[PDB]
Design a protein around this ligand. Structure first.
Ligand SMILES: Nc1ncnc2c1ncn2[C@@H]1O[C@H](COP(=O)(O)OP(=O)(O)O)[C@@H](O)[C@H]1O
Lengths: 322, 435, 48, 193, 97
C-alpha cells in the first residue's frame, strides 16, 4: 500500500443500510475512526467504518438533511436541512446546541471555516450566508448568484469560498471583503459539486498542465467543478482559465475531490459508477460499479485508505484501497 | 468587355464576337422563355429552336441545348464539364453552407449570377425544399459586393415589414435632388430576400398591398414616405423573391403588372439520379468515420433515396397540409446519422441500419396523424432496409422499440426501454422537488 | 395576428428587425458590447 | 494666430468662406493630433510591457489578448498612414477621429489594469517605490530607449539627475547631477549584458 | 487619482506640449487655512517637492511660481507665512480715481 497512491477496489468492504430515504452526503471524522452520513429522512446516522457497526442517529431536523460537515478539531458537526434551518451539534454529547434560521428557502450546503469560528452556508434563495459559531448570528451575506446555489466550499486557509449554482456559473468570493474574485463559467449545464486542490497537489497540477513555475512560488488555488453535462473541469482561480476538462462520466457528476496524496481525482456521478481520474494524462483508469442507483456523494479519508460513497438506494458503502 | 480586359494585347475579334453573340442569343432565348417551366417544356422549346434557327448548335443527338452553355471563345460547351465529383470533408457533411455541384445547380447559379449582376429583380419559383434559398445564397458567394437580408412573408405581411428593415439596414439622407435611401454601409448592394412573396393575402378586390409596394419601388425606383408625403428614391437596393407555385394551397398568383419587371426561374425537385449523386457524396464523406462501413455507402444512399420517394408519393398535401416532404428531410437524415456516428470508433453493419431506421421514423413518422400511416411507415422501413441490405441480422437491427438517447451514456447510443423508464422515473423525483 | 407575425420572423431569421428602436436599440448595444467582452471577442460597430 | 488677425481685418468680408474653412481644418488637425500624440506615447510604453515580459501572458491572460487586438489594429491604422503619410489624407481618413478616441479609451483601460503587475515589479528594484504608476510604466516600457529615461533618475536618487552613456547608448559610463557635476564609473555598466 | 493642483503641476513637469519652456504661474485665489496650505510646506520650502501619500514626489520646476491672492491671514499659521514672500496691497494703492 503506497501511502499516497491507494485507489478503491471493486470488492466492497461494508454495505451499511439503515436509512429510510436516499443518502444525501457522507463524510469522515477528522480525528476519530467514525463515519457520519446524512439522508433525506431528516436523520444523520453515525457509523464506524472499521467494524461496520451502526452507533446512533442524530435526529432533530424536520425535513431532509442536505449537507453535513466537521470542523478541524472534529468536536462540532454542522448540518443543514431543507427546513430552512442550520443545526450545530456537540459531537461528544450528540445533541443540537444551536439552531440557525435566516435562509428564505431550501439550504443545500454548509461548511465550517478552517479557523472553526465561522460557518458558511448556501441555500435556494440565491444567497450565501455566514454565521458565528459562538453566537449563531448571521454576519455576512454573499449575493450575486442568479439562481439556486447548490454547494459552497472554502479553501485551505479559509480566505476564499467557492460556490456553484443553478446559473451554470462557479463564483469565487473573498471572505474578508465579500467581493467576487472570479466568475468561472464554462459548463454548458447546471454545476453540482466543487472541490479545492490540497497543498500536496499544486506541484503535480502545475507539471501536469504544463504551467510554468511562477516567480512568486505559489501556482495559485485550483478548483474543480463537476456539473451535470457529464464533464469535470479544473480551474485556475488566480487566472480564471479552465486548465483541463475531464470526460467519461455517463450522467450528471454529483461529487468530485482529490486524492489525499494529490495524485488522482475521485468523482462519483449518477451513472451508478465511481471513477478515478488521472489528471496527469487526462484519462480514467478504473470504473467502479458502486451502487445499483445514483451515487449522491463520496468522501476520501485523509490518512486511512478508505473511501465512502452515498447513494439514492439508501445504502452507504465503504471501499478498501489496495 | 471583361474578356478584353483580361486580354489587353488581343482584343476580341469580330468573327469571335459574331459567333459568341449568336450562341448566347439562343442560350438567352431558352432561359428567358422557358426558365419558369418544367424540364420537359425546356427540352421542347430547344427542339423548336433547333428546327427553325440557323445558328450553329450542339451536335449531341439527345442532349438538349439547355445543357450547353456558351463559352467566351464562342463555342458550345456542355454543363457536364463544370460538375466534378467532389469529395466533401467529413466535418462539413450536409452542412448548410456546402452545396454539391449538379447539372441543375450550375445552370441556375450562372443564370442567377447574370440577373443579379444587373441588379435586376428576380423570383425563384418551386416546391418547398427544392433549393431556391440555397441556389441564391450560392450565387451570392460569387458576388462579394452584395449583402443579403432575409425577410419571410406571411398572410398578414404588409409593407411596413419592408419599412422596418429599411431603418435597420439603410439610412435616409437629404440630397439636392431629393431624399435618397441607401444602405448605411458603403460600396455593397443590399439584397432583400423575400422568401414567401405570394402568401400576402389579397383583399376582396384581388390586390396585395406589399406586392404593389414592391412593384412601385422597382418600376419607379422608390416610394413615398407616409410621415411627410415625401418621395424617396432607392439607391443600391435589390429585390429577390422566392415562392411556392401559385397552385399550392394558401398561395395567390402575382399581378401581371408586377411580373413584367421580374423574371421567374423554376427550381424543380432534384430527380432520383440527382438525389443519388448529391447524397451519395454526403454518404461517402460521412461514412469515412468508420472505415469498415465504407463499402455500404452506395446501398445506404439507394435506401435513403428509395424510401424518400415512396414516402413523398404516399403522403401528399391533399390528406394533411403539413405532409410536405423535400430534400430537406434527407439533409436532416444525413445530419442525424452523421451525429450518431461521430463519437463511435466502430460500429457493425446492423448498428448502421438501426441508426438509419431510427432517423427515418423521427423524420417521416412523427408528423403522421393516424395509426394507419404510422403502421405503413413501420412496415415499409423494414422492406426497404431488407431490399438494399440483405444477409444481415433482422432482429438485431429491426428491434421495434427503436430508442436512441444520450441520457444514459456520454454518446448517442441505443437505449433499452426498461432502463430508460427507470432513469426517467428517478429524474422525475428530482424534477418534482426542483421545478 | 401580430403575435404570429413577430414569431414568424423570429423563427426563420432569429431576429426581429422591428423590435429594438430608439433607446431600446441604443440600450441593446450596451450589453451586446458587455456580452461580447465576457465571451472574449471585441466588437465595436453596431452591425457586427 | 495669423487668421485671427485676418478676422479683425476690415477686408475679411470678401474671404469669409475660405478663411473660416481653414479654421475647421486647422482645429480638426489640432483635435486629431492632440489625442494622437498621447495615444502614440501610450502604445510605445505599453508594447514594451507586453513584449519584454514573459510572465505577463500567464499572469494577465485576459487583457493581454485584448492588447494584441488593440495593437494589431493600431498597427493596421499606422500601416495605412505609412502608405499615404500626407497630413490631409490622414485627416480625411474615414472615421479617424473616433478611432483614436477608442484607442485612448482602450489603452487607458489596459493601463489601469496593470496596477498589480507594477506593484509586484517594484519589489525587483526597491527605488521604484518612489515612482508613480504612469512614470514607472514609462520607465519599464521604454527600457530600450534610454534617452528618455534621463528625466526620472531625480525621483530615484538623491543627486543623480541624469546618467552618462556611450554613443551606442549601450554602456553606462557615469552619472550626472543637476549642476553638471559628473562621476566617472571605474567599471562601466553594460546594458547589453 | 490626481487632484486639481497635482494634475496641473504634473502636466507642467511632463511638458508633453512644451510646458517647461513657458512661464507657468499657479495662483491660489481664495482663503488660506492650514487644512490645505500646509500640504505645500515642502513645495514652498527649499525642498521644492510636492509629496503625495502614494509616495510620489513631484519636483518643482524652476520656471513655475506658486502664487497666493488672499485678503487676510487671520487663520494662516506661522509656517505658511514664513515660507512665502509677502507683498502687501493696502487699500490706498487703488484709489477711487
Ligand atoms: N446539390 C445539392 N447539394 C447539397 N444539398 C442540396 C442539393 N440540392 C438540394 N439540397 C438540399 O435541399 C435543401 C434545400 O432547401 P431550401 O433551399 O432551404 O428550400 P427553399 O429554398 O424552398 O427554402 C437544402 O437543405 C440542401 O441541403
Amino acid at each position: 500500500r503506497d501511502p499516497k497512491e491507494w485507489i478503491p477496489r471493486p470488492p466492497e468492504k461494508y454495505a451499511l443500510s439503515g436509512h429510510r430515504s436516499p443518502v444525501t452526503r457522507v463524510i469522515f471524522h477528522p480525528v476519530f475512526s467514525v463515519m457520519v452520513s446524512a439522508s433525506e429522512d431528516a436523520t444523520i446516522k453515525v457509523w464506524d467504518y472499521e467494524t461496520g457497526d451502526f452507533e446512533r442517529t442524530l435526529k432533530g431536523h424536520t425535513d431532509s438533511v442536505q449537507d453535513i460537515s466537521f470542523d478541524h478539531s472534529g468536536k462540532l458537526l454542522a448540518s443543514c436541512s431543507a427546513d430552512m434551518t442550520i443545526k450545530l451539534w456537540d459531537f461528544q454529547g450528540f445533541e443540537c446546541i444551536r439552531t440557525m434560521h435566516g435562509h428564505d428557502h431550501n439550504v443545500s450546503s454548509v461548511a465550517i471555516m478552517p479557523n472553526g469560528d465561522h460557518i458558511v452556508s448556501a441555500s435556494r434563495d440565491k444567497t450565501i450566508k455566514m454565521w458565528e459559531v459562538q453566537t449563531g448570528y448571521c454576519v455576512k451575506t454573499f449575493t450575486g448568484h442568479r439562481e439556486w446555489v447548490r454547494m459552497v466550499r472554502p479553501n485551505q486557509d479559509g480566505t476564499l469560498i467557492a460556490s456553484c449554482s443553478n446559473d451554470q456559473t462557479v463564483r469565487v468570493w473573498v471572505v474578508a471583503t465579500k467581493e467576487c474574485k472570479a466568475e468561472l463559467r464554462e459548463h454548458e449545464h447546471v454545476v453540482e459539486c466543487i472541490s479545492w486542490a490540497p497543498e500536496s497537489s499544486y506541484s503535480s497540477i502545475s507539471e501536469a498542465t504544463g504551467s510554468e513555475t511562477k516567480k512568486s512560488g505559489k501556482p495559485g488555488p485550483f478548483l474543480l467543478s463537476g456539473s451535470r453535462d457529464k464533464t469535470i473541469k479544473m480551474w485556475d482561480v488566480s487566472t480564471g482559465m479552465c486548465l483541463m476538462t475531464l470526460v467519461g462520466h455517463d450522467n450528471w457528476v454529483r461529487g468530485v475531490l482529490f486524492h489525499s496524496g494529490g495524485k488522482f481525482i475521485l468523482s462519483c456521478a449518477d451513472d451508478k459508477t465511481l471513477r478515478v481520474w488521472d489528471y496527469k494524462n487526462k484519462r480514467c483508469m478504473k470504473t467502479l460499479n458502486a451502487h445499483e442507483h445514483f451515487v449522491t456523494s463520496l468522501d476520501f479519508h485523509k490518512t486511512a485508505p478508505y473511501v465512502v460513497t452515498g447513494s439514492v438506494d439508501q445504502t452507504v458503502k465503504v471501499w478498501e484501497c489496495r | 468587355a471583361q474578356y478584353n480586359a483580361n486580354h489587353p494585347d488581343f482584343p476580341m475579334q469580330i468573327e469571335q464576337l459574331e459567333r459568341y453573340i449568336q450562341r448566347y442569343l439562343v442560350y438567352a432565348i431558352l432561359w428567358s422563355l422557358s426558365g419558369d417551366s418544367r424540364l420537359k417544356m425546356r427540352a421542347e422549346l430547344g427542339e423548336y429552336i433547333r428546327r427553325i434557327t440557323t445558328v450553329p448548335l450542339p451536335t449531341a443527338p439527345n442532349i438538349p441545348i439547355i445543357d450547353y452553355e456558351v463559352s467566351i471563345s464562342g463555342e458550345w460547351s456542355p454543363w457536364q464539364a463544370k460538375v466534378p465529383q467532389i469529395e466533401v470533408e467529413t466535418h462539413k457533411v450536409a452542412a448548410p453552407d456546402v452545396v454539391v455541384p449538379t447539372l441543375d445547380t450550375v445552370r441556375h447559379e450562372a443564370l442567377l449570377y447574370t440577373w443579379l449582376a444587373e441588379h435586376k429583380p428576380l423570383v425563384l419559383c418551386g416546391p418547398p425544399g427544392s433549393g431556391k434559398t440555397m441556389t441564391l445564397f450560392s450565387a451570392l458567394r460569387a458576388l462579394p459586393d452584395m449583402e443579403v437580408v432575409g425577410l419571410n412573408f406571411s398572410s398578414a405581411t404588409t409593407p411596413e415589414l419592408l419599412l422596418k428593415t429599411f431603418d435597420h439596414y439603410c439610412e435616409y439622407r437629404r440630397t439636392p435632388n431629393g431624399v435618397v435611401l441607401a444602405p448605411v454601409q458603403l460600396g455593397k448592394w443590399l439584397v432583400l430576400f423575400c422568401d414567401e412573396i405570394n402568401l400576402p393575402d389579397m383583399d376582396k378586390y384581388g390586390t396585395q398591398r406589399v406586392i404593389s409596394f414592391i412593384r412601385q419601388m422597382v418600376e419607379h425606383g422608390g416610394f413615398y414616405r407616409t410621415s411627410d408625403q415625401t418621395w424617396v428614391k432607392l439607391e443600391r437596393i435589390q429585390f429577390v423573391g422566392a415562392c411556392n407555385p401559385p397552385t399550392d394551397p394558401g398561395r395567390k398568383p402575382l399581378s401581371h403588372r408586377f411580373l413584367r419587371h421580374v423574371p421567374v426561374v423554376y427550381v424543380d425537385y432534384p430527380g432520383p439520379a440527382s438525389l443519388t449523386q448529391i447524397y451519395g457524396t454526403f454518404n461517402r464523406a460521412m461514412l469515412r468515420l468508420i472505415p469498415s462501413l465504407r463499402t455500404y455507402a452506395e446501398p445506404l444512399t439507394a435506401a435513403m433515396v428509395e424510401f424518400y420517394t415512396m414516402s413523398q408519393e404516399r403522403f401528399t398535401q391533399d390528406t394533411q397540409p403539413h405532409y410536405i416532404y423535400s430534400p430537406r428531410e434527407m439533409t436532416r437524415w444525413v445530419r442525424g446519422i452523421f451525429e450518431a456516428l461521430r463519437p463511435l470508433e466502430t460500429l457493425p453493419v446492423e448498428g448502421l441500419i438501426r441508426i438509419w431506421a431510427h432517423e427515418a421514423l423521427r423524420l417521416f413518422q412523427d408528423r403522421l396523424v393516424e395509426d394507419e400511416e404510422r403502421r405503413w411507415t413501420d412496415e415499409n422501413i423494414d422492406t426497404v432496409a431488407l431490399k438494399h441490405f440483405p444477409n444481415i441480422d433482422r432482429e438485431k437491427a429491426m428491434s421495434r422499440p427503436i430508442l436512441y438517447s444520450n441520457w444514459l451514456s456520454k454518446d448517442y447510443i441505443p437505449v433499452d426501454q426498461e432502463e430508460l423508464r427507470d432513469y426517467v422515473k428517478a429524474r422525475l423525483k428530482v424534477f418534482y422537488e426542483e421545478e | 395576428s401580430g403575435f404570429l407575425e413577430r414569431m414568424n420572423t423570429l423563427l426563420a431569421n432569429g431576429e426581429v428587425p422591428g423590435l429594438f428602436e430608439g433607446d431600446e436599440y441604443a440600450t441593446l448595444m450596451t450589453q451586446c458590447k458587455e456580452g461580447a467582452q465576457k465571451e472574449g471577442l471585441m466588437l465595436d460597430s453596431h452591425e457586427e | 494666430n495669423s487668421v485671427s488677425a485676418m478676422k479683425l481685418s476690415p477686408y475679411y468680408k470678401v474671404f469669409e468662406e475660405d478663411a473660416l474653412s481653414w479654421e475647421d481644418k486647422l482645429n480638426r488637425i489640432m483635435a486629431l493630433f492632440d489625442v494622437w500624440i498621447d495615444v502614440q506615447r501610450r502604445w510605445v510604453y505599453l508594447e514594451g510591457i507586453f513584449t519584454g515580459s514573459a510572465d505577463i501572458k500567464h499572469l494577465l491572460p485576459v487583457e493581454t489578448q485584448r492588447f494584441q487586438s488593440i495593437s494589431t489594429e493600431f498597427l493596421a491604422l499606422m500601416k495605412k498612414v505609412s502608405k499615404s503619410p500626407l497630413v490631409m489624407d490622414v485627416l480625411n481618413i474615414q472615421g479617424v477621429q473616433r478611432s483614436l478616441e477608442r484607442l485612448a479609451d482602450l489603452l487607458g483601460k489596459i493601463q489601469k489594469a496593470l496596477g498589480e503587475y507594477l506593484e509586484r515589479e517594484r519589489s525587483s528594484f526597491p527605488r521604484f517605490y518612489f515612482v508613480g504608476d504612469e512614470d514607472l510604466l514609462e520607465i519599464i516600457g521604454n527600457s530600450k530607449n534610454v534617452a528618455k529615461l534621463q528625466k526620472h533618475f531625480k525621483k530615484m536618487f538623491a543627486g543623480v539627475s541624469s546618467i552618462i552613456l556611450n554613443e551606442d547608448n549601450s554602456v553606462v559610463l557615469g552619472i550626472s547631477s543637476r549642476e553638471g557635476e559628473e562621476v566617472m564609473f571605474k567599471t562601466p555598466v553594460s546594458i547589453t549584458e | 487619482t490626481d487632484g486639481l493642483f497635482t494634475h496641473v503641476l504634473r502636466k507642467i513637469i511632463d511638458s508633453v506640449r512644451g510646458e517647461l519652456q513657458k512661464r507657468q504661474w499657479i495662483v491660489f485665489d481664495g482663503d488660506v487655512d492650514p487644512e490645505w496650505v500646509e500640504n505645500l510646506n515642502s513645495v514652498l520650502d527649499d525642498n521644492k517637492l510636492l509629496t503625495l501619500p502614494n509616495g510620489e514626489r513631484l519636483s518643482l520646476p524652476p520656471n513655475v511660481r506658486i502664487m497666493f491672492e488672499v485678503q487676510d491671514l487671520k487663520y494662516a499659521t506661522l509656517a505658511t507665512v514664513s515660507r512665502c514672500g509677502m507683498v502687501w496691497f493696502s487699500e490706498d494703492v487703488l484709489s477711487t480715481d
